[PDB]
Description:
This is Lysozyme C. The chain has 129 residues and is mostly helical. The protein has one domain. It has four helices and three strands; from the N terminus they run H-H-E-E-E-H-H. A three-stranded antiparallel beta sheet has the order 1-2-3. Bound molecules: sodium ion (NA). Sodium ion binds next to loops.
Amino acid sequence: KVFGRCELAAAMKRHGLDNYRGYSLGNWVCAAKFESNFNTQATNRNTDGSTDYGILQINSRWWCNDGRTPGSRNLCNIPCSALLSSDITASVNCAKKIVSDGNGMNAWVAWRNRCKGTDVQAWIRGCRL
Ligand code: NA
């Protein structure tokens, strides 16, 4: 599923991401824009053999099982395919664990490089929230 900007903002707010660990909803929408272009089915293979999955490009090295990332963990206790669903529940629940990990949203390269320090509220501007 490819979400609209305001459609994703509404879904993330319903699932409790607005101000989760102090990160405003615009931070999460900005991260999803630059990680996946709002596409739940996005996948990207990394140099280390791990893969990034879904709207927030969550990595198989630590967070999910994809059956082909040797010596990796599954800290969200999910198959990586769960992160590709039209329903963002699994991605949101796993993102909450990731952002609690120590480096906050710096865990998302696209957030650090393209969202951090910018007018992230622009990403929810005009939305009926
Ligand atoms: Na894994």
